[PDB]
Structure formats: C-alpha cells, structure tokens
PDB file of C-alpha atoms and ligand atoms in Angstrom:
ATOM      1  CA  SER M   1       0.000   0.000   0.000  1.00  0.00           C
ATOM      2  CA  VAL M   2       3.047   2.295  -0.262  1.00  0.00           C
ATOM      3  CA  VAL M   3       5.680   3.078  -2.921  1.00  0.00           C
ATOM      4  CA  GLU M   4       9.360   3.889  -2.291  1.00  0.00           C
ATOM      5  CA  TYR M   5      10.685   7.198  -3.619  1.00  0.00           C
ATOM      6  CA  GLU M   6      13.994   9.027  -3.222  1.00  0.00           C
ATOM      7  CA  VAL M   7      15.080  12.690  -3.523  1.00  0.00           C
ATOM      8  CA  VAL M   8      18.347  14.537  -3.136  1.00  0.00           C
ATOM      9  CA  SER M   9      19.231  16.457   0.051  1.00  0.00           C
ATOM     10  CA  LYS M  10      22.783  17.645   0.400  1.00  0.00           C
ATOM     11  CA  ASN M  11      24.726  20.721   1.325  1.00  0.00           C
ATOM     12  CA  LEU M  12      28.409  20.721   0.380  1.00  0.00           C
ATOM     13  CA  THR M  13      31.163  23.317   0.317  1.00  0.00           C
ATOM     14  CA  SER M  14      30.433  24.547  -3.219  1.00  0.00           C
ATOM     15  CA  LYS M  15      26.902  23.350  -3.966  1.00  0.00           C
ATOM     16  CA  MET M  16      23.561  22.467  -2.461  1.00  0.00           C
ATOM     17  CA  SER M  17      20.717  20.364  -3.796  1.00  0.00           C
ATOM     18  CA  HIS M  18      17.591  20.620  -1.674  1.00  0.00           C
ATOM     19  CA  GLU M  19      14.466  18.673  -2.672  1.00  0.00           C
ATOM     20  CA  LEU M  20      11.355  17.997  -0.586  1.00  0.00           C
ATOM     21  CA  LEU M  21       8.035  16.359  -1.270  1.00  0.00           C
ATOM     22  CA  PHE M  22       4.741  18.056  -0.445  1.00  0.00           C
ATOM     23  CA  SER M  23       1.450  16.134  -0.182  1.00  0.00           C
ATOM     24  CA  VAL M  24      -1.284  17.538  -2.417  1.00  0.00           C
ATOM     25  CA  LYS M  25      -3.937  15.835  -0.286  1.00  0.00           C
ATOM     26  CA  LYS M  26      -2.576  16.940   3.103  1.00  0.00           C
ATOM     27  CA  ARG M  27      -1.291  20.353   1.954  1.00  0.00           C
ATOM     28  CA  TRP M  28       1.961  20.104   3.854  1.00  0.00           C
ATOM     29  CA  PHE M  29       5.386  18.483   3.562  1.00  0.00           C
ATOM     30  CA  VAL M  30       5.574  14.701   3.566  1.00  0.00           C
ATOM     31  CA  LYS M  31       7.560  13.140   6.384  1.00  0.00           C
ATOM     32  CA  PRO M  32      10.499  11.082   5.071  1.00  0.00           C
ATOM     33  CA  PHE M  33      10.917   7.614   6.495  1.00  0.00           C
ATOM     34  CA  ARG M  34      14.725   7.675   6.307  1.00  0.00           C
ATOM     35  CA  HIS M  35      17.486  10.135   5.551  1.00  0.00           C
ATOM     36  CA  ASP M  36      20.954   9.314   4.360  1.00  0.00           C
ATOM     37  CA  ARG M  37      23.488  11.973   5.347  1.00  0.00           C
ATOM     38  CA  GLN M  38      26.339   9.963   3.763  1.00  0.00           C
ATOM     39  CA  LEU M  39      24.881   9.864   0.256  1.00  0.00           C
ATOM     40  CA  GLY M  40      22.739  12.955   0.755  1.00  0.00           C
ATOM     41  CA  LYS M  41      19.317  11.427   0.155  1.00  0.00           C
ATOM     42  CA  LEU M  42      15.838  11.472   1.665  1.00  0.00           C
ATOM     43  CA  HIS M  43      13.689   8.366   1.350  1.00  0.00           C
ATOM     44  CA  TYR M  44       9.893   8.310   1.319  1.00  0.00           C
ATOM     45  CA  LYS M  45       7.177   5.668   1.380  1.00  0.00           C
ATOM     46  CA  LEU M  46       4.285   7.160  -0.561  1.00  0.00           C
ATOM     47  CA  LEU M  47       0.582   6.329  -0.732  1.00  0.00           C
ATOM     48  CA  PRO M  48      -0.701   6.355  -4.313  1.00  0.00           C
ATOM     49  CA  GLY M  49      -1.726   9.888  -5.270  1.00  0.00           C
ATOM     50  CA  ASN M  50      -0.331  13.281  -6.181  1.00  0.00           C
ATOM     51  CA  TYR M  51       2.717  15.046  -4.764  1.00  0.00           C
ATOM     52  CA  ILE M  52       4.616  18.202  -5.453  1.00  0.00           C
ATOM     53  CA  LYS M  53       8.380  18.217  -5.386  1.00  0.00           C
ATOM     54  CA  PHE M  54      10.134  21.499  -4.533  1.00  0.00           C
ATOM     55  CA  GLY M  55      13.751  21.653  -5.681  1.00  0.00           C
ATOM     56  CA  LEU M  56      16.472  24.214  -4.953  1.00  0.00           C
ATOM     57  CA  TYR M  57      19.841  23.816  -6.748  1.00  0.00           C
ATOM     58  CA  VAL M  58      22.611  26.171  -5.714  1.00  0.00           C
ATOM     59  CA  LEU M  59      26.140  26.804  -6.914  1.00  0.00           C
ATOM     60  CA  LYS M  60      27.492  28.902  -4.080  1.00  0.00           C
ATOM     61  CA  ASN M  61      30.638  30.167  -5.830  1.00  0.00           C
ATOM     62  CA  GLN M  62      28.570  31.326  -8.822  1.00  0.00           C
ATOM     63  CA  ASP M  63      25.962  32.899  -6.557  1.00  0.00           C
ATOM     64  CA  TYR M  64      23.457  30.856  -8.628  1.00  0.00           C
ATOM     65  CA  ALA M  65      20.151  29.393  -7.475  1.00  0.00           C
ATOM     66  CA  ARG M  66      17.610  27.470  -9.577  1.00  0.00           C
ATOM     67  CA  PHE M  67      14.191  26.757  -8.056  1.00  0.00           C
ATOM     68  CA  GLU M  68      11.865  24.124  -9.548  1.00  0.00           C
ATOM     69  CA  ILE M  69       8.380  22.780  -8.858  1.00  0.00           C
ATOM     70  CA  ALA M  70       7.487  19.341 -10.170  1.00  0.00           C
ATOM     71  CA  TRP M  71       4.284  17.310 -10.076  1.00  0.00           C
ATOM     72  CA  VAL M  72       4.802  13.705  -8.979  1.00  0.00           C
ATOM     73  CA  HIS M  73       2.164  11.126  -9.730  1.00  0.00           C
ATOM     74  CA  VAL M  74       2.242   7.835  -7.834  1.00  0.00           C
ATOM     75  CA  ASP M  75       0.126   4.903  -9.033  1.00  0.00           C
ATOM     76  CA  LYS M  76      -1.127   1.722  -7.341  1.00  0.00           C
ATOM     77  CA  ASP M  77       1.138  -0.453  -9.474  1.00  0.00           C
ATOM     78  CA  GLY M  78       4.196   1.445  -8.220  1.00  0.00           C
ATOM     79  CA  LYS M  79       4.499   3.524 -11.388  1.00  0.00           C
ATOM     80  CA  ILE M  80       5.877   7.014 -10.763  1.00  0.00           C
ATOM     81  CA  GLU M  81       5.610   9.857 -13.262  1.00  0.00           C
ATOM     82  CA  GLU M  82       7.136  13.336 -12.811  1.00  0.00           C
ATOM     83  CA  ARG M  83       6.552  16.633 -14.644  1.00  0.00           C
ATOM     84  CA  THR M  84       8.270  19.976 -14.096  1.00  0.00           C
ATOM     85  CA  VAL M  85       5.623  22.739 -13.903  1.00  0.00           C
ATOM     86  CA  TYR M  86       7.815  25.709 -12.979  1.00  0.00           C
ATOM     87  CA  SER M  87      11.514  26.622 -13.025  1.00  0.00           C
ATOM     88  CA  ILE M  88      13.341  29.923 -12.434  1.00  0.00           C
ATOM     89  CA  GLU M  89      16.997  30.995 -12.132  1.00  0.00           C
ATOM     90  CA  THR M  90      18.207  33.831  -9.883  1.00  0.00           C
ATOM     91  CA  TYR M  91      20.960  34.761  -7.435  1.00  0.00           C
ATOM     92  CA  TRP M  92      21.457  32.648  -4.336  1.00  0.00           C
ATOM     93  CA  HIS M  93      21.774  35.845  -2.258  1.00  0.00           C
ATOM     94  CA  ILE M  94      18.250  36.780  -3.322  1.00  0.00           C
ATOM     95  CA  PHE M  95      16.654  33.393  -2.876  1.00  0.00           C
ATOM     96  CA  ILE M  96      18.186  32.855   0.530  1.00  0.00           C
ATOM     97  CA  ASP M  97      16.777  36.204   1.705  1.00  0.00           C
ATOM     98  CA  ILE M  98      13.173  35.201   0.949  1.00  0.00           C
ATOM     99  CA  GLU M  99      13.383  33.484   4.335  1.00  0.00           C
ATOM    100  CA  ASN M 100      13.270  36.885   6.064  1.00  0.00           C
ATOM    101  CA  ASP M 101      10.455  38.422   4.068  1.00  0.00           C
ATOM    102  CA  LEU M 102       7.507  39.505   6.255  1.00  0.00           C
ATOM    103  CA  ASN M 103       4.975  38.781   3.504  1.00  0.00           C
ATOM    104  CA  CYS M 104       5.625  35.957   1.027  1.00  0.00           C
ATOM    105  CA  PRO M 105       4.171  32.482   0.457  1.00  0.00           C
ATOM    106  CA  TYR M 106       4.554  30.510   3.698  1.00  0.00           C
ATOM    107  CA  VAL M 107       5.239  27.168   2.022  1.00  0.00           C
ATOM    108  CA  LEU M 108       8.144  28.732   0.111  1.00  0.00           C
ATOM    109  CA  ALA M 109       9.670  30.411   3.190  1.00  0.00           C
ATOM    110  CA  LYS M 110       9.287  27.118   5.087  1.00  0.00           C
ATOM    111  CA  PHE M 111      10.861  25.145   2.236  1.00  0.00           C
ATOM    112  CA  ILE M 112      13.893  27.459   2.165  1.00  0.00           C
ATOM    113  CA  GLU M 113      14.186  27.411   5.971  1.00  0.00           C
ATOM    114  CA  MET M 114      14.311  23.569   5.859  1.00  0.00           C
ATOM    115  CA  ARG M 115      17.338  23.461   3.540  1.00  0.00           C
ATOM    116  CA  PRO M 116      19.971  20.923   4.662  1.00  0.00           C
ATOM    117  CA  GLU M 117      22.634  22.128   7.097  1.00  0.00           C
ATOM    118  CA  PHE M 118      26.218  21.527   5.965  1.00  0.00           C
ATOM    119  CA  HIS M 119      26.905  17.813   5.454  1.00  0.00           C
ATOM    120  CA  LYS M 120      23.421  16.915   6.727  1.00  0.00           C
ATOM    121  CA  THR M 121      19.987  16.340   5.165  1.00  0.00           C
ATOM    122  CA  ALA M 122      16.844  18.429   5.504  1.00  0.00           C
ATOM    123  CA  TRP M 123      14.362  16.838   7.913  1.00  0.00           C
ATOM    124  CA  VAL M 124      10.631  17.458   8.339  1.00  0.00           C
ATOM    125  CA  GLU M 125       8.731  17.133  11.603  1.00  0.00           C
ATOM    126  CA  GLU M 126       5.584  15.227  12.404  1.00  0.00           C
ATOM    127  CA  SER M 127       2.547  17.376  11.640  1.00  0.00           C
ATOM    128  CA  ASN M 128      -1.195  17.537  11.052  1.00  0.00           C
ATOM    129  CA  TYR M 129      -0.903  21.103   9.820  1.00  0.00           C
ATOM    130  CA  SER M 130      -2.179  22.082   6.339  1.00  0.00           C
ATOM    131  CA  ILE M 131      -1.879  25.416   4.523  1.00  0.00           C
ATOM    132  CA  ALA M 132      -5.107  27.085   3.390  1.00  0.00           C
ATOM    133  CA  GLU M 133      -4.424  27.141  -0.361  1.00  0.00           C
ATOM    134  CA  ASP M 134      -5.076  24.243  -2.721  1.00  0.00           C
ATOM    135  CA  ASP M 135      -2.200  23.107  -4.943  1.00  0.00           C
ATOM    136  CA  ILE M 136      -3.114  25.410  -7.820  1.00  0.00           C
ATOM    137  CA  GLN M 137      -3.474  28.619  -5.749  1.00  0.00           C
ATOM    138  CA  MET M 138      -0.333  27.605  -3.877  1.00  0.00           C
ATOM    139  CA  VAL M 139       1.794  27.263  -6.997  1.00  0.00           C
ATOM    140  CA  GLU M 140       0.339  30.412  -8.512  1.00  0.00           C
ATOM    141  CA  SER M 141       1.128  32.394  -5.338  1.00  0.00           C
ATOM    142  CA  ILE M 142       4.723  31.161  -5.475  1.00  0.00           C
ATOM    143  CA  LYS M 143       5.114  32.125  -9.148  1.00  0.00           C
ATOM    144  CA  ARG M 144       3.581  35.555  -8.628  1.00  0.00           C
ATOM    145  CA  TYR M 145       5.813  36.274  -5.652  1.00  0.00           C
ATOM    146  CA  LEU M 146       9.001  35.142  -7.391  1.00  0.00           C
ATOM    147  CA  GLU M 147       8.157  37.103 -10.578  1.00  0.00           C
ATOM    148  CA  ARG M 148       8.096  40.243  -8.438  1.00  0.00           C
ATOM    149  CA  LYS M 149      11.121  39.382  -6.318  1.00  0.00           C
ATOM    150  CA  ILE M 150      13.072  38.498  -9.459  1.00  0.00           C
TER     151      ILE M 150
HETATM  152 CL1  LIG F 201      32.694  18.920   0.554  1.00  0.00          CL
HETATM  153 CL1  LIG F 202      33.535  27.445  -8.941  1.00  0.00          CL
HETATM  154 CL1  LIG F 203       0.492  13.595 -14.031  1.00  0.00          CL
HETATM  155 HG1  LIG F 204      -0.781  13.613 -11.258  1.00  0.00          HG
HETATM  156 HG1  LIG F 205       6.921  35.011   4.228  1.00  0.00          HG
HETATM  157 NI1  LIG F 206      20.623  11.033  10.716  1.00  0.00          NI
HETATM  158 NI1  LIG F 207      -2.181   7.289 -12.910  1.00  0.00          NI
HETATM  159 NI1  LIG F 208       0.424  29.337 -13.786  1.00  0.00          NI
END
C-alpha cells in the first residue's frame, strides 16, 4: 500500500541540492521515512496519489540558485511519473533572503528554511498542519511572488 521514492538532500562546500516532497492531499510536507546523510538522500514511502516536489539547486561560488516545482504522480502499481511545472533561475543571495520576508508564500519560506545544514539532510517534523491554499493557488502564489522578487 506504499511506494518507495527518493530525492536529493545535500549541502556541500560549493553546492547544495535541496528537494522535498509536499502532499497535495494533506497540503503540507511529507515526512520522510529515512534520511541518508552519507549519500545525501531522503527516502519516502508514498501512498498512491499526487505530490509536489520542490527543488532548490545552488552553486554557491557562482551565486546561482535554480528553483523548480514538479508534479509527482504515484500509481497503485508502483508507477511514478514526474513533470516539471515551474523553473526559475536567480541569485542565491536573493533566494536565501526570501526566508526573512515579512509577507511571502509561507510554504516557500518554510521550504527554504528547511534546507539541509552543511553535510546533513533536511528533515521534516511530524505534523497535522495544512496550509489554506489548494495546490493550484499555492503554486500560482509562489510564481507571482518570485516574478516580483526576481
Ligand atoms: Cl565537501
Ligand atoms: Cl567554482
Ligand atoms: Cl500527471
Ligand atoms: Hg498527477
Ligand atoms: Hg513570508
Ligand atoms: Ni541522521
Ligand atoms: Ni495514474
Ligand atoms: Ni500558472
């Protein structure tokens, strides 16, 4: 009744790759079942259904940050299908600062805040919390905010 799924979570001297899964149904981040700080991975066991993957890819020395949103579809038979629905490039110094914005989409600030510490992975606590926006409004709010910021 669950499917295994892996994403990248690592923060190294020169680069960071920070991915997390978000449950469409629950409207909050999915809790990983295992993290691998050695290989820099997060492992999930997923019920069939729809998920959003947030991805942040940073080259620190180039002051470069790419942010992506992907739709992840998980079927009964174990089949997983992924589609990128949004991608933007900007400076790391800008993207990192979103954290401190007084008004911006909460899910995005939370995502950034949860980035992996150096040589660790990004964890996600137990929760029954859900944001108020559905997946469409949520994504649109993120795009609108980043269009302005960038
Ligand atoms: Cl290193
Ligand atoms: Cl370099
Ligand atoms: Cl799909
Ligand atoms: Hg889907
Ligand atoms: Hg904010
Ligand atoms: Ni650990
Ligand atoms: Ni399907
Ligand atoms: Ni749109």
